Nucleic acid binder design. Structure first.
Ligand SMILES: Nc1ncnc2c1ncn2[C@H]1C[C@H](O)[C@@H](COP(=O)(O)OP(=O)(O)OP(=O)(O)O)O1
Ligand SMILES: OC[C@H]1O[C@@](CO)(O[C@H]2O[C@H](CO)[C@@H](O)[C@H](O)[C@H]2O)[C@@H](O)[C@@H]1O
Ligand SMILES: [Mg+2]
Ligand SMILES: [Mg+2]
Lengths: 412, 555
DNA sequence: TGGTCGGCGCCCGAACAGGGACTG
DNA sequence: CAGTCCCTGTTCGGGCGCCG
């Protein structure tokens, strides 16, 4: 007996109709067990083909969890409700979260199951469970409460959420707390022990309200950037200077102060690539000045809350991956590199999956948004394996690119 | 007043739209006889009801003879009613494969009598069914009828039946957790490890359960005894095979001929190893009339010959043993053709298949093998819910060299090398660093957008030079041509500097095959080299050799 | 006679997206 | 600084095979 906040799709827009993809035996068994308890608890109830809407479902294990977690891919539904959360009930983003020495992430999705869901909206949460070898037709469900991974669930629950938060917020007025989807981000500058302790107290607050909590520890102040860097060589071959001029020429699309003239002067003839070229004094200084400009920040790059974040990733090899986050081309809000991630030197898809997860997390902490990824992978390759390695409760938007590397700008 | 048997499914029309109206077909009197007897029979059951002209809806009707039977099948063309009926979400997510089935001591295959006609249609929606009956003459009007039950040819029939059937089935399944029931439309496959007498007890008891909801399983299509006929397969206690496939014998082939042929051979390739459709499909590309006659090349003929000979010997697959591993082995068949076998015990196949898809204008065997592995993995997960271990005709070091060096993320799941030739390899490797003592060719080409005329040429550190005129070309084609020239005119080791990103992108992905003959010739030369270093510089930067060759080809 | 529905598979071609290079 | 043209790759609907 609680009022159900009415929910509407964006205007002139129809519900998600997205085919369910094949699932492994372990994932189907996990979902069947999860859903059956959910049906008995009344969170979901079976439905039929009259409901034309469907969203894909699968299961994941969080890092070190060993326990199956139901994950619904609501990306299509969320875009069709996109106006609702941003315009009306959106959570504000604490610009201070990225500055905290430690930030812990808690899965509070279970709480959303408390509140019920608008009777008129439930038709859009439909998801089908497949069977191995198609022994059975699809077992369809729909949600009676606030679904985990929908963008309405934190927004509608925010009024309830803040009241539960309000005692703890007043007992620790400098601890920053942020809510993105099923997760609670809790940052503090305390020492490690105090921080983890304070985390338990927040867990107790949820417990008395009746929400079970199963957390990731971040350190946004540790987070660094990966600037463009020019090599350091005792002697320079023609090929070396040719590589350098092309890099610099591309870099000049970002830092307009780059100059190649004095370095081009070294290439004047028609020379063998391995011929050694001494650098002139004028080139040495031009190369010096450039190395400084690349330390500098780009002119007039700032975040625009209206624009979308775009993330690009490059596979550098030997387990090394570089990324840039931006909104307008060549104006990069952040650039970074990852190395020695899980699956390094054995599995590219696992490494790409990890990197996507890390980058998304950083963007949530920093801008409170997930970027749209440009993924350096074939579409068929990614779709086959990505769910195997996914350990997160959200799913960003992505697209697939094939751009071979004319220049190694981002990584030496 | 009629009667209600099992729970119905609400079915609205699409909003602001109204029921079907369209006049009946000029049905031949011979067909007309069959419907009248059946339709009158339905009314006594309560499947159908008469309607006064207060029902202003008409939709055509026809019928086809039941295959392998004297009976006739009764189809209501609902194309306009579908158009205006609400969309459903199909619950049929695929087709069951026999290789998925575990071995069962006792198996029963039984069919439901009049499947769609035992399932009530939505009460409010019943009005839209209306169709006009026909007579031997045009004098007698014929009665108007509205279905009280799901009708064949509606776009909502399959999903409603499948969802309704599962709801009826579920209570029984919960009661008997150890029975396997494969439910596909109205065909039910029941398997148990119960001894045959006990199994039939459950089988009959299941028949009673379906009876309670008005679902009738006649003895007429009840299979107590092997070999069972199920989903186009013949099921035996320890093995299965496809029901025999007849390939047309025609001496002269039309277009429609090859399509049927091709589509049969694809069905055959799930068990028969090594089926090849490449050359038979070559005959179908860019043809106008389905009726048009087409002659078979000596390629499509030879192919078709070995395809028929494979069918000569009977083959069979086995069933799935969850205890043992799944194994997929792949062979390269040439011309972008791959076949594979999935098995558990050596030489006892669960199923076979082929991957022939040509993806990309320029590609290599390693990319295609990766594609075939992915297709097998997804197929395996559907049938068995797990990924097979892979046996691949590619050296462990070849794969390591490819994937580490490629700029795209690529991966193959757990696999081992099998030394069955032809082995898959990279035909050439580009050097990471410039080659000392090798001649450096600065290459470029340009072409005039209007004339389609162009030049391709190179300049080198030794002073070697060439420029060649070309006709009916493009900038892209001349940049490739420039590279081809440097390869032709160079020794076994050569450094090439281009400003063409297009060409560099093609070549760096180590293609061994291309739709472009020019790229094939470049490949041909790359394979003959000992060392090639390709490097890129930006055009119009006044750099070195590149500027000079740029002037020559621009002229 | 020619004619319905849903599912899955293949191979095809056409229509569409988008990224560089070059043209004014 | 737009507007093309190349060239490539994706999508989608058509035919057929197969199952109800
Ligand atoms: N060619 C078709 N067109 C439309 N629907 C079909 C067609 N074939 C089969 N179906 C549907 C309707 C049937 O009720 C259901 C089962 O097929 P089927 O068993 O062959 O006929 P049937 O069950 O109605 O008669 P029977 O029990 O005597 O075989 O699948
Ligand atoms: O990966 C693309 C592929 O994913 C699907 C279904 O999973 O679409 C989902 O992912 C897209 C890319 O993020 C979203 O834009 C879309 O909303 C979501 O349904 C397929 O539709 C698509 O082919
Ligand atoms: Mg039947
Ligand atoms: Mg040029």
């Amino acid at each position: 007996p609680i009022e159900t906040v009415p929910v509407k799709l964006k205007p002139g827009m129809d519900g998600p109709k997205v085919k369910q993809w094949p699932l492994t035996e372990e994932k189907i068994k996990a979902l069947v067990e999860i859903c059956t308890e959910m049906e008995k608890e009344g969170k979901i109830s079976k439905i039929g083909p009259e409901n034309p809407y469907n969203t894909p479902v699968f299961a994941i294990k969080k890092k070190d969890s060993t326990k199956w977690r139901k994950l619904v891919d609501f990306r299509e539904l969320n875009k069709r409700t996109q106006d609702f959360w941003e315009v009306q009930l959106g959570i504000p983003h604490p610009a201070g979260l990225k500055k905290k020495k430690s930030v812990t992430v808690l899965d509070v999705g279970d709480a959303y199951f408390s509140v019920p869901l608008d009777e008129d909206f439930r038709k859009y949460t439909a998801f089908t469970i497949p069977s191995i070898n198609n022994e059975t037709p699809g077992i369809r469900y729909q949600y009676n409460v606030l679904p985990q991974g929908w963008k309405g669930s934190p927004a509608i629950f925010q009024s309830s959420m803040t009241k539960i938060l309000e005692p703890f917020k007043k007992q620790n007025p400098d601890i920053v707390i942020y809510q993105y989807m099923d997760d609670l981000y809790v940052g503090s500058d305390l020492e490690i022990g105090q921080h983890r302790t304070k985390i338990e107290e927040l867990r107790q607050h949820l417990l008395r309200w009746g929400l079970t909590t199963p957390g990731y520890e971040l350190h946004p102040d540790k987070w660094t950037v990966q600037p463009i860097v020019l090599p350091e060589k005792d002697s320079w071959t023609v090929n070396d200077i040719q590589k350098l001029v092309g890099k610099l020429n591309w870099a000049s699309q970002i830092y307009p102060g780059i100059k190649v003239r004095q370095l081009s002067k070294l290439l004047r003839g028609t020379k063998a690539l391995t011929e050694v070229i001494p650098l002139t004094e004028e080139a040495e200084l031009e190369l010096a000045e450039n190395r400084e400009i690349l330390k500098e920040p780009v002119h007039g790059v700032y975040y625009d809350p209206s624009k979308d974040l775009i993330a690009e990733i490059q596979k550098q090899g030997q387990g090394q991956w570089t990324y840039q986050i931006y909104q307008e081309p060549f104006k990069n809000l952040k650039t970074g590199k990852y190395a020695r991630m899980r699956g390094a030197h054995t599995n590219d898809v696992k490494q790409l999956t990890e990197a996507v997860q890390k980058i998304t997390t950083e963007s949530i902490v920093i801008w409170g948004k997930t970027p749209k990824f440009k993924l350096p992978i074939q579409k068929e390759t990614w779709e086959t394996w990505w769910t195997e390695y996914w350990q997160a409760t959200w799913i960003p938007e992505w697209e697939f690119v094939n751009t071979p590397p004319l220049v190694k700008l981002w990584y030496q | 007043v009629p009667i209600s048997p099992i729970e119905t499914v609400p079915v609205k029309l699409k909003p602001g739209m109204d029921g079907p109206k369209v006049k009946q077909w000029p049905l031949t009197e011979e067909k007309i006889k069959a419907l009248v007897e059946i339709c009158t029979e339905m009314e006594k059951e309560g499947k159908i009801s008469k309607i006064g002209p207060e029902n202003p809806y008409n939709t055509p009707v026809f019928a086809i003879k039941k295959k392998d039977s004297t009976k006739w099948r009764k189809l209501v063309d609902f194309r306009e009613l579908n158009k205006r009926t609400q969309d459903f979400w199909e619950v049929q997510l695929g087709i069951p494969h026999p290789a998925g089935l575990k071995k069962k001591k006792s198996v029963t295959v039984l069919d439901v009598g009049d499947a769609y006609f035992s399932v009530p249609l939505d009460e409010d929606f019943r009005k839209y069914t209306a169709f006009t009956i026909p007579s031997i003459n045009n004098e007698t009007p014929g009665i108007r009828y509205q279905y009280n039950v799901l009708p064949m040819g509606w776009k909502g029939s399959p999903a409603i039946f499948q969802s309704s059937m599962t709801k009826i089935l579920e209570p029984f399944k919960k009661q008997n957790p150890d029975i396997v029931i494969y439910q596909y439309m109205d065909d039910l496959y029941v398997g148990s490890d119960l001894e045959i007498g006990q199994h039939r007890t459950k089988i009959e008891e299941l028949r009673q359960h379906l009876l309670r909801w008005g679902l009738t399983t006649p003895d007429k299509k009840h299979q107590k005894e092997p070999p069972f006929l199920w989903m186009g397969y013949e099921l035996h206690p320890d093995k299965w095979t496809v029901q025999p496939i007849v390939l047309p014998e025609k001496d002269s082939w039309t277009v429609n001929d090859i399509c049927k042929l091709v589509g049969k051979l694809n069905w055959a390739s799930q068990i028969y190893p090594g089926i090849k459709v490449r050359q038979l499909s070559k005959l179908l590309r860019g043809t106008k009339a389905l009726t048009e006659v087409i002659p078979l090349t000596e390629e499509a003929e030879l192919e078709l010959a070995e395809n028929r000979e494979i069918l000569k010997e009977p083959v069979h697959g086995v069933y799935y043993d969850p205890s043992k591993d799944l194994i997929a082995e792949i062979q390269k068949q040439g011309q972008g053709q791959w076949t594979y076998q999935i098995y558990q015990e050596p030489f006892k196949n669960l199923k076979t298949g082929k991957y022939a898809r040509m993806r990309g204008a320029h590609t290599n065997d390693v990319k295609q093998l990766t594609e075939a592995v992915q297709k097998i993995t997804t197929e395996s997960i559907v049938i068995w819910g797990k990924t097979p271990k892979f046996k691949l005709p590619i050296q462990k070091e070849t794969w390591e060299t490819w994937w580490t060096e490629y700029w795209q993320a690529t991966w193959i799941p757990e696999w081992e090398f099998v030394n069955t030739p032809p082995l898959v390899k990279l035909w050439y490797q580009l050097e990471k660093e410039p080659i000392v003592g090798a001649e450096t060719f600065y290459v470029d080409g340009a072409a005039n957008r209007e004339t389609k005329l162009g030049k391709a040429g190179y300049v080198t550190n030794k002073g070697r030079q060439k420029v060649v005129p070309l006709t009916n070309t493009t900038n892209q084609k001349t940049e490739l041509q420039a590279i081809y020239l440097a390869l032709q005119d160079s020794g076994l080791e050569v450094n090439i500097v281009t400003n063409s990103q297009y060409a560099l992108g093609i070549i760096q992905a180590q293609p061994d095959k291309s739709e472009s003959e020019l790229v094939n010739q470049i490949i041909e030369q790359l394979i003959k080299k000992e060392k090639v270093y390709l490097a890129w510089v930006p055009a119009h930067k006044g750099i070195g050799g590149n500027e000079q060759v740029d002037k020559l080809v621009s002229a």
